[PDB]
Amino acid sequence: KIPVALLTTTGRKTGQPRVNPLYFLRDGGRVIVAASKGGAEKNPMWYLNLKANPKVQVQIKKEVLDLTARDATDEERAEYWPQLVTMYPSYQDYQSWTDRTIPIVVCEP
Ligand SMILES: C[C@H](OP(=O)(O)OC[C@@H](O)[C@@H](O)[C@@H](O)Cn1c2nc(=O)[nH]c(=O)c-2cc2ccc(O)cc21)C(=O)N[C@@H](CCC(=O)N[C@@H](CCC(=O)O)C(=O)O)C(=O)O
Secondary structure (H helix, E strand, C coil): CCCCEEEEEECCCCCCEEEEEECCEEECCEEEEECCHHHCCCCCHHHHHHHHCCEEEEEECCEEEEEEEEECCHHHHHHHHHHHHHHCCHHHHHHHHCCCCCCEEEEEC
């Protein structure tokens, strides 16, 4: 239905690789994900991990991409958020129900 990307982050405490499935957009070499965690009030751990260890790896089907993750800028959110919402409308609910602003993470070559 919606394909997932596998995001590997380095544990910001343990240093161990952690892998999580996420929905994604691809734009010009970038992989974009949202740290929505089903509308939970706290950011997911993988987001905390990539804040401490920006080098991540993303696997989409066969491709294994070595990327550097960062938060979307305001202008990027305005471009990507509607695309994410179009793809998976629940994102908009999750954003409504959560106090924190749901991070949009841009992973770049
Ligand atoms: C529960 C925790 O996961 P998390 O990193 O908080 O991520 C929560 C969710 O985002 C994650 O489960 C997503 O995969 C859920 N999820 C999506 N989550 C999203 O946020 N966005 C999505 O688009 C998304 C899509 C999706 C599709 C299918 C599916 O099955 C799940 C999907 C986890 O895996 N904990 C591990 C590892 C935790 C970890 O990374 N530890 C760090 C320390 C972290 C710290 O305490 O600071 C370390 O090793 O050093 C553990 O405790 O054993």
